[PDB]
Design an enzyme around this catalytic site. Structure first.
Site, PDB file in Angstrom:
ATOM      1  N   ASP A 129       7.038   5.062  -4.401  1.00 29.00           N
ATOM      2  CA  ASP A 129       8.015   5.759  -3.556  1.00 29.00           C
ATOM      3  C   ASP A 129       8.864   6.721  -4.369  1.00 29.00           C
ATOM      4  O   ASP A 129      10.090   6.740  -4.273  1.00 29.00           O
ATOM      5  CB  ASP A 129       8.874   4.732  -2.778  1.00 29.00           C
ATOM      6  CG  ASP A 129       9.719   5.365  -1.680  1.00 29.00           C
ATOM      7  OD1 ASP A 129       9.378   6.460  -1.174  1.00 29.00           O
ATOM      8  OD2 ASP A 129      10.743   4.752  -1.323  1.00 29.00           O
ATOM      9  N   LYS A 131      10.825   9.738  -5.252  1.00 27.42           N
ATOM     10  CA  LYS A 131      11.613  10.589  -4.357  1.00 27.42           C
ATOM     11  C   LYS A 131      12.906  10.912  -5.080  1.00 27.42           C
ATOM     12  O   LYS A 131      13.332  10.133  -5.919  1.00 27.42           O
ATOM     13  CB  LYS A 131      12.008   9.811  -3.091  1.00 27.42           C
ATOM     14  CG  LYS A 131      10.929   9.670  -2.060  1.00 27.42           C
ATOM     15  CD  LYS A 131      11.492   9.063  -0.793  1.00 27.42           C
ATOM     16  CE  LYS A 131      12.697   8.194  -1.103  1.00 27.42           C
ATOM     17  NZ  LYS A 131      13.101   7.458   0.111  1.00 27.42           N
ATOM     18  N   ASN A 134      15.338   8.191  -5.370  1.00 32.46           N
ATOM     19  CA  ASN A 134      15.072   7.082  -6.277  1.00 32.46           C
ATOM     20  C   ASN A 134      15.090   7.514  -7.746  1.00 32.46           C
ATOM     21  O   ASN A 134      14.572   6.806  -8.606  1.00 32.46           O
ATOM     22  CB  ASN A 134      13.720   6.438  -5.983  1.00 32.46           C
ATOM     23  CG  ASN A 134      13.671   5.738  -4.637  1.00 32.46           C
ATOM     24  OD1 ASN A 134      14.682   5.274  -4.130  1.00 32.46           O
ATOM     25  ND2 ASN A 134      12.481   5.660  -4.056  1.00 32.46           N
ATOM     26  N   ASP A 150      14.147   1.759  -8.567  1.00 30.86           N
ATOM     27  CA  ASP A 150      13.586   1.267  -7.301  1.00 30.86           C
ATOM     28  C   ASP A 150      12.069   1.127  -7.293  1.00 30.86           C
ATOM     29  O   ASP A 150      11.389   1.754  -6.490  1.00 30.86           O
ATOM     30  CB  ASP A 150      14.041   2.199  -6.163  1.00 30.86           C
ATOM     31  CG  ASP A 150      13.958   1.543  -4.799  1.00 30.86           C
ATOM     32  OD1 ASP A 150      13.552   0.361  -4.724  1.00 30.86           O
ATOM     33  OD2 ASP A 150      14.297   2.221  -3.797  1.00 30.86           O
ATOM     34  N   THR A 162      10.593   8.774   2.344  1.00 30.58           N
ATOM     35  CA  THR A 162      10.598   9.781   3.402  1.00 30.58           C
ATOM     36  C   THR A 162       9.271  10.556   3.409  1.00 30.58           C
ATOM     37  O   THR A 162       8.560  10.650   2.368  1.00 30.58           O
ATOM     38  CB  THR A 162      11.886  10.698   3.366  1.00 30.58           C
ATOM     39  OG1 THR A 162      11.740  11.824   4.250  1.00 30.58           O
ATOM     40  CG2 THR A 162      12.198  11.191   1.972  1.00 30.58           C
ATOM     41  N   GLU A 328       5.599  12.376 -35.445  1.00 31.69           N
ATOM     42  CA  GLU A 328       6.913  12.866 -35.004  1.00 31.69           C
ATOM     43  C   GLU A 328       8.014  12.520 -36.003  1.00 31.69           C
ATOM     44  O   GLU A 328       8.907  13.328 -36.239  1.00 31.69           O
ATOM     45  CB  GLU A 328       7.264  12.386 -33.597  1.00 31.69           C
ATOM     46  CG  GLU A 328       6.632  13.268 -32.502  1.00 31.69           C
ATOM     47  CD  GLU A 328       6.605  12.603 -31.136  1.00 31.69           C
ATOM     48  OE1 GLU A 328       6.944  11.402 -31.048  1.00 31.69           O
ATOM     49  OE2 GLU A 328       6.244  13.275 -30.135  1.00 31.69           O
ATOM     50  N   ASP A 401      24.106 -20.324 -26.984  1.00 36.14           N
ATOM     51  CA  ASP A 401      24.747 -21.596 -26.709  1.00 36.14           C
ATOM     52  C   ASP A 401      24.214 -22.161 -25.397  1.00 36.14           C
ATOM     53  O   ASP A 401      24.858 -22.061 -24.352  1.00 36.14           O
ATOM     54  CB  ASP A 401      26.265 -21.417 -26.652  1.00 36.14           C
ATOM     55  CG  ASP A 401      27.008 -22.728 -26.438  1.00 36.14           C
ATOM     56  OD1 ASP A 401      26.572 -23.762 -26.990  1.00 36.14           O
ATOM     57  OD2 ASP A 401      28.039 -22.719 -25.727  1.00 36.14           O
ATOM     58  N   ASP A 428      26.875 -29.383 -41.323  1.00 34.58           N
ATOM     59  CA  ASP A 428      26.891 -30.438 -40.298  1.00 34.58           C
ATOM     60  C   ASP A 428      25.767 -30.316 -39.245  1.00 34.58           C
ATOM     61  O   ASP A 428      25.873 -30.856 -38.138  1.00 34.58           O
ATOM     62  CB  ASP A 428      28.291 -30.581 -39.658  1.00 34.58           C
ATOM     63  CG  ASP A 428      28.544 -29.593 -38.515  1.00 34.58           C
ATOM     64  OD1 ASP A 428      28.346 -28.370 -38.688  1.00 34.58           O
ATOM     65  OD2 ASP A 428      28.965 -30.052 -37.433  1.00 34.58           O
ATOM     66  N   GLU A 430      24.760 -28.279 -36.982  1.00 33.80           N
ATOM     67  CA  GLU A 430      24.994 -27.260 -35.954  1.00 33.80           C
ATOM     68  C   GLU A 430      25.821 -26.057 -36.435  1.00 33.80           C
ATOM     69  O   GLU A 430      26.531 -26.125 -37.444  1.00 33.80           O
ATOM     70  CB  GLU A 430      25.609 -27.875 -34.691  1.00 33.80           C
ATOM     71  CG  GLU A 430      24.614 -28.658 -33.831  1.00 33.80           C
ATOM     72  CD  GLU A 430      24.957 -28.643 -32.340  1.00 33.80           C
ATOM     73  OE1 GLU A 430      26.145 -28.461 -31.989  1.00 33.80           O
ATOM     74  OE2 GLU A 430      24.034 -28.812 -31.510  1.00 33.80           O
TER      75      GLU A 430
HETATM   76  N1  ANP Z   1      21.278   1.253 -12.016  1.00 41.56           N
HETATM   77  C1  ANP Z   1      22.032   1.655 -10.969  1.00 41.56           C
HETATM   78  N2  ANP Z   1      23.239   2.249 -11.153  1.00 41.56           N
HETATM   79  C2  ANP Z   1      24.023   2.644 -10.125  1.00 41.56           C
HETATM   80  N3  ANP Z   1      23.661   2.492  -8.838  1.00 41.56           N
HETATM   81  C3  ANP Z   1      22.487   1.907  -8.504  1.00 41.56           C
HETATM   82  C4  ANP Z   1      21.586   1.437  -9.573  1.00 41.56           C
HETATM   83  N4  ANP Z   1      20.514   0.913  -8.968  1.00 41.56           N
HETATM   84  C5  ANP Z   1      20.697   1.037  -7.633  1.00 41.56           C
HETATM   85  N5  ANP Z   1      21.875   1.627  -7.355  1.00 41.56           N
HETATM   86  C6  ANP Z   1      22.417   1.916  -6.004  1.00 41.56           C
HETATM   87  O1  ANP Z   1      22.072   0.857  -5.100  1.00 41.56           O
HETATM   88  C7  ANP Z   1      21.261   1.339  -4.033  1.00 41.56           C
HETATM   89  C8  ANP Z   1      20.093   0.417  -3.733  1.00 41.56           C
HETATM   90  O2  ANP Z   1      19.213   0.405  -4.863  1.00 41.56           O
HETATM   91  P1  ANP Z   1      17.634   0.239  -4.671  1.00 41.56           P
HETATM   92  O3  ANP Z   1      17.025  -0.053  -6.029  1.00 41.56           O
HETATM   93  O4  ANP Z   1      17.074   1.410  -3.908  1.00 41.56           O
HETATM   94  O5  ANP Z   1      17.593  -1.047  -3.663  1.00 41.56           O
HETATM   95  P2  ANP Z   1      16.236  -1.722  -3.076  1.00 41.56           P
HETATM   96  O6  ANP Z   1      16.666  -2.547  -1.894  1.00 41.56           O
HETATM   97  O7  ANP Z   1      15.582  -2.487  -4.212  1.00 41.56           O
HETATM   98  N6  ANP Z   1      15.078  -0.519  -2.570  1.00 41.56           N
HETATM   99  P3  ANP Z   1      15.366   0.539  -1.212  1.00 41.56           P
HETATM  100  O8  ANP Z   1      15.359  -0.366   0.010  1.00 41.56           O
HETATM  101  O9  ANP Z   1      14.212   1.515  -1.203  1.00 41.56           O
HETATM  102  O10 ANP Z   1      16.709   1.185  -1.458  1.00 41.56           O
HETATM  103  C9  ANP Z   1      20.796   2.731  -4.446  1.00 41.56           C
HETATM  104  O11 ANP Z   1      20.895   3.542  -3.287  1.00 41.56           O
HETATM  105  C10 ANP Z   1      21.797   3.205  -5.479  1.00 41.56           C
HETATM  106  O12 ANP Z   1      22.806   3.980  -4.820  1.00 41.56           O
HETATM  107 CA    CA Z   2       6.709  11.251 -28.676  1.00 35.68          CA
HETATM  108 CA    CA Z   3      22.382 -24.981 -28.462  1.00 35.13          CA
HETATM  109 CA    CA Z   4      28.482 -26.069 -39.112  1.00 34.44          CA
END
Ligand code: ANP
Ligand code: CA
Ligand code: CA
Ligand code: CA
Ligand code: CA
Length: 446
Positions: A129, A131, A134, A150, A162, A328, A401, A428, A430
């Site tokens: 997906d 997009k 995502n 996603d 979409t 590289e 821990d 001791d 640990e």
């Molecule tokens: N790493 C991230 N940092 C900030 N915002 C995030 C992050 N991951 C997800 N989000 C927000 O959370 C929303 C949902 O994330 P998403 O991974 O699409 O959920 P999902 O239920 O796994 N898949 P979908 O149903 O297609 O949205 C997204 O629209 C982002 O706005």
């Molecule tokens: Ca490379």
């Molecule tokens: Ca331990």
């Molecule tokens: Ca110790």
């Protein structure tokens, strides 16, 4: 699994998808902020041991354009997938704001989509997906990394609730790696023209066009775009998947190569010398030190701390895939000398850059993957004193821990003997926090 609540507090809702909700959470000790996907076990599970396996595979993805996952925790009700918090919003918003992008700006954006997607495919992950919704911007900063999000969950979990980006074959039920190349192609068409190639009044009409693979460069704006870009798009929007180029071939396209020709300059010399000094010192540490430092850098650093090194990483990463290979590293060192006014031949008076990189590669390539991935670069090139803040050592301690209050010699060994006798300075059995701190300092020490 893990105890989520002991470790993090929930700060706020960030987003809700069909799989679960995404929350902002804060590490109780470090105050560092993280995005957490909460997935209900009973509404969503579709497979918990098979899930842990596939999440493990998602966890070890190590690439600048792929969402970074730190851990998966588990309650009686939920899985908590803890990852990097990105604050730039969706690529989608940037398209609405800018309308469309210069060739230079489109190439730089799509190169990262290509790099991430190439990386996923090499790990047998198809996005399905792809997009602009995502893809997130790492931050609001001007030239920041984009991050693919996603994906990976579809086997393990059921969604709930979409057309522009779907390949023709997805209409027949198929979702192979070529469908991601198609989706990326539709994105590139949009970045350059501002308009979807398969467009219509509504979904009905859109799908009619997708199905026949019929698009064109008829819009007036196409007049002002190179044949190079058009050639790329055409290869990506090829109807038959077997004739459609791979992600690697996208990434290697001459149009890409041309606009993401990033390369070290004189202004990079201070950060380049920093990285080299830290790398040299890293290689001098024993294996146990290197592993704890790598573990610490990759679990406990922040995006703000890695930003100079990410720029360097890009400038060294000649082929734009997300990683540093041996050649590289060799060119990079040579370039570094040239910029500085130093003749690489001076190095004998006691080995060449090539000999030096060749002996370094085993040391820095800690998983033996054949490449130095992002986190291996960061661990080796950062100022590791950054790891020695009290909160981070406390979080590290706490990570090991498992039982009660102290780290058993019997835990730490299976969590890794020569060194164990030394760090335990009272003897001791640990290991308390004080010995743990001293051991960590010794690791950064030399
Ligand atoms: N790493 C991230 N940092 C900030 N915002 C995030 C992050 N991951 C997800 N989000 C927000 O959370 C929303 C949902 O994330 P998403 O991974 O699409 O959920 P999902 O239920 O796994 N898949 P979908 O149903 O297609 O949205 C997204 O629209 C982002 O706005
Ligand atoms: Ca490379
Ligand atoms: Ca331990
Ligand atoms: Ca110790
Ligand atoms: Ca590696």
């Amino acid at each position: 699994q893990g105890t989520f609540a002991e470790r993090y507090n929930i700060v706020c809702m960030l987003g809700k998808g069909s799989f679960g909700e995404v929350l902002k959470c804060k590490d109780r000790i470090t105050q560092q902020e993280y995005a957490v996907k909460v997935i209900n076990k009973a509404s969503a599970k579709n497979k918990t041991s098979t899930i842990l396996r596939e999440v493990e595979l998602l966890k070890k993805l190590d690439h600048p354009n792929i969402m970074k996952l730190f851990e998966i925790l588990e309650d009686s009700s939920s899985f908590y997938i803890v990852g990097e918090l990105y604050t730039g919003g969706e690529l989608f918003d940037e398209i609405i704001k800018r309308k469309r992008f210069s060739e230079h700006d489109a190439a730089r954006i799509i190169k990262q989509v290509f790099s991430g997607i190439t990386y996923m495919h090499k790990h047998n992950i198809v996005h399905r997906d792809l997009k602009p919704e995502n893809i997130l911007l790492e931050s609001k900063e001007k030239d920041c990394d984009i991050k693919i999000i996603d994906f990976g969950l579809s086997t393990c979990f059921q969604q709930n609730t979409t057309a522009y980006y779907i390949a023709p074959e997805v209409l027949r039920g198929t979702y192979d790696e070529k469908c991601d190349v198609w989706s990326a192609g539709v994105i590139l068409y949009i970045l350059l023209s501002g308009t979807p190639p398969f467009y219509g009044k509504n979904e009905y009409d859109i799908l009619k066009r997708v199905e026949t693979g019929k698009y064109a460069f008829d819009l007036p704006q196409w007049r002002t775009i190179s044949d190079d870009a058009k050639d790329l798009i055409r290869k990506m929007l090829t109807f038959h998947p077997s004739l459609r180029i791979t992600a690697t071939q996208c990434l290697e396209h001459p149009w890409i190569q041309k606009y993401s020709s990033e390369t070290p300059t004189i202004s990079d010399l201070p950060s380049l010398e920093s990285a080299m000094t830290n790398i040299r010192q890293f290689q001098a540490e024993k294996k146990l030190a290197q592993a704890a430092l790598l573990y610490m850098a990759s679990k406990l650093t922040t995006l703000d701390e890695t930003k100079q090194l990410t720029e360097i990483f890009r400038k060294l990463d000649t082929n734009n895939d997300g990683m540093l290979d041996r050649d590289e590293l060799v060119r990079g060192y040579h370039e570094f000398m040239r910029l500085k006014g130093v003749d690489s031949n001076s190095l004998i008076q006691g080995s060449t850059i090539e000999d030096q990189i060749d002996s370094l590669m085993p040391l820095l390539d800690m998983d033996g993957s054949g490449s130095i991935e992002y986190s291996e670069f960061i661990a080796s090139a950062i100022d590791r004193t950054i790891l020695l803040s009290r909160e981070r050592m406390e979080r590290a301690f706490k990570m090991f821990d498992k039982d009660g209050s102290g780290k058993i010699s019997t835990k730490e060994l299976f969590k890794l003997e020569s060194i164990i006798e030394q760090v335990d300075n009272n003897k001791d059995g640990e290991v308390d926090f004080n010995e743990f701190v001293e051991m960590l300092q010794n690791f950064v020490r030399n």
